Amino acid sequence: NIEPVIIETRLELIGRYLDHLKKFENISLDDYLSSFEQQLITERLLQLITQAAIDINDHILSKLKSGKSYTNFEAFIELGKYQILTPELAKQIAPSSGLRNRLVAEFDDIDPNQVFMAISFALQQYPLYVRQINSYLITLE
Amino acid sequence: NIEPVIIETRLELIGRYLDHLKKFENISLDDYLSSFEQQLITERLLQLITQAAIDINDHILSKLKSGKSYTNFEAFIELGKYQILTPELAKQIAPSSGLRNRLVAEFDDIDPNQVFMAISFALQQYPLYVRQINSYLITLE
Amino acid sequence: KIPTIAELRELSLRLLTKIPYLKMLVLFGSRATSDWDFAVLYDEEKYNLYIQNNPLAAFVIPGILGEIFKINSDKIDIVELNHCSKLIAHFVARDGKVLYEEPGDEFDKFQQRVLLSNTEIKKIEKTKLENIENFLQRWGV
Amino acid sequence: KIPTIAELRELSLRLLTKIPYLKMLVLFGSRATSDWDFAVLYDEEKYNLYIQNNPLAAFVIPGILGEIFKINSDKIDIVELNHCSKLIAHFVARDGKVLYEEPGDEFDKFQQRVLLSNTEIKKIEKTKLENIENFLQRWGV
């Protein structure tokens, strides 16, 4: 019931967002805090990356557990139970749901120091997410 | 029951976001569509502007209509009924709620041509929003 | 409560005057077969003249649909069928349930125009899989 | 259903082992007196050591609170009392309802430390009103 072409479109977008986010991998904390423009770019990129993954996770779970509802945090954990993601990656990447909500929270007021840490987190974990979802699609034939 | 210092903090943020958004007021559509970086900055700025206004509208309505629930679109319209915003501004600025949802939608896939129009919209209407909320706070003594 | 597809079809007759540039409204996503996913098809002539007096007329559709359908307009995602990818138009035509239609055969003319064959989707899948694999090779994961 | 403040206080005893660096949890916003607004106070020592094995430990609190309180973690907004403005800490101390507290007098020591006088808030209001008025003058509205 899963549509691979829909998931592949979102994985393709995650790769494009990560290529743009990689341009900020060597920026020091001081230069990052002094540039409001670079903060806005990385915040928007991190928001689009996490939302694309949430879109993929919901599409997979809607066909493996039809009618069942999952929070964005529990969706990552559920993929780890079924080995679609490794349990190690699922636990490490699950806090990206909290990063998503902080980036779209009505209260806003996000801490740029915490966003700085999320840049290094996303550049390390989300490439692994793309690999493991890609392997799941290949297994689905 | 309204806390003016909370509203003033958000109005101050809207002014800072608009000052950064103003740097894009003279960019042509062609140069804007060719720059993914400038699209991310303007999208994040427009999201923070609309969310700050939604935060102000909910705070005002929670003290004028305690317990009553309002959608973000109907919240702008309700402020126009009570002349906190002029009915003309409330009708023109109410679609900013749809802009907010499009910027935070799970599906993402926002049209940069429509965001380009929203830049000129926000630079014209949200300064008027700051003025009218500021006058409401002054009237509240 | 949540409205059924039947009352959505009856309430959609009020859209001809509220959204005069609307030619077709299609419901897709979870609600058809959660958030409310609508696909809209504008009359290219009326929308252009409508935008002169409404700088953000596209972003006001969720607010209009929310007051007419009595649903939370903050959970409405709109897809412009006039300017979208060929992939999105395919799944909207395949799984969508039409709510408003002028003329009475607009949804059929839409399906015949945008439906992709299995071979065309396979070619799209191959291109995106190559793009994903290239990303994985460049990032060393 | 939605849990009351009483069961939130009882379920919060499980946080000492789930969130070992947590020292205080306060509920504020609409739920106390809608989304769930929590203010957290970390032990500065344990959180630093916790971040070494958890690159985004702050963003996992909503997911942890969601599974413990049985509430939608996508509607949870977290405020770090360790690194926030003096204005936010004031209203959290004034209107917040403490859910977790170690020691039993941590909320009192917090209120005595961050509560602002009426004169101090008036000075903050004057500065922000001058900032808003300067914005309005520069923008010619």
Curated annotation (Swiss-Prot), chains A, B:
It catalyses: (tRNA)-3'-end (ribonucleoside 5'-phosphate)-(guanosyl 5'-phosphate)-(cytosyl 5'-phosphate)-(cytosyl 5'-phosphate)-(adenosine 5'-phosphate) + H2O = GpCpCpA + tRNA 3'-end (ribonucleotide 3'-phosphate) + H(+). One of its GO terms (cellular component) is toxin-antitoxin complex. Leads to an increase of mass of 659 Da. Probably one subunit of the dimer is di-AMPylated, the complex dissociates and then reassociates to di-AMPylate the other HepT subunit. Its EC number is 3.1.27.-. A motif (RX(4)HXY motif) lies at residues 100-107. The modification O-di-AMP-tyrosine is found at F107. A motif (Y-loop) lies at residues 105-111. The active site is at R100, A105. GO terms for molecular function: endonuclease activity; nucleotide binding; RNA nuclease activity. Gene3D superfamilies: bsu32300-like. Keywords: Endonuclease, Hydrolase, Nuclease, Nucleotide-binding, Phosphoprotein, Toxin-antitoxin system. The keyword Lipid biosynthesis does not apply. InterPro entries: HepT-like, HepT-like_sf, Type_VII_TA_RNase. Transmembrane segments: none annotated. Homodimer. The fully di-AMPylated homodimer is not found in a complex with MntA. Toxic component of a type VII toxin-antitoxin (TA) system. Upon cloning in E.coli inhibits cell growth for several hours; eventually cells recover and start growing. Cleaves the last 4 nucleotides from the tRNA acceptor stem (shown in vitro with E.coli tRNA-Glu(UUC)); only cleaves intact tRNA. Has no activity on mRNA. Neutralized by coexpression with cognate antitoxin MntA, which is due to di-AMPylation of the RNase. Part of a locus that includes subtype I-D CRISPR-Cas genes. Belongs to the HepT RNase toxin family. This is tRNA nuclease HepT. It comes from Aphanizomenon flos-aquae (strain 2012/KM1/D3). The lineage of its organism: Bacteria, Bacillati, Cyanobacteriota, Cyanophyceae, Nostocales.
Curated annotation (Swiss-Prot), chains C, D:
The active site is at D35, D37. Coiled coil: none annotated. Its EC number is 2.7.7.108. Changing D35A: No longer neutralizes HepT, no di-AMPylation of HepT. Pfam families: Polbeta (PF18765). It catalyses: L-tyrosyl-[protein] + ATP = O-(5'-adenylyl)-L-tyrosyl-[protein] + diphosphate; O-(5'-adenylyl)-L-tyrosyl-[protein] + ATP = O-[5'-(adenylyl-(5'->3')-adenylyl)]-L-tyrosyl-[protein] + diphosphate. Gene3D superfamilies: Beta Polymerase, domain 2. Mg(2+) 1 binds at D35, D37, D77. Mg(2+) 2 binds at D35, D37. CDD domains: NT_KNTase_like. It is an enzyme of class 2 (transferase). Belongs to the MntA antitoxin family. Antitoxin component of a type VII toxin-antitoxin (TA) system. Upon cloning in E.coli neutralizes the effect of cognate toxin HepT. Neutralization is mostly due to di-AMPylation of toxin by this enzyme. Successively di-AMPylates HepT on 'Tyr-109'. In vitro will use ATP, dATP, GTP, dGTP, TTP or UTP to generate a mono-modified protein, but requires a purine nucleotide for the second modification reaction (ATP, dATP or GTP). This is Protein adenylyltransferase MntA. It comes from Aphanizomenon flos-aquae (strain 2012/KM1/D3). The lineage of its organism: Bacteria, Bacillati, Cyanobacteriota, Cyanophyceae, Nostocales. The gene is mntA.
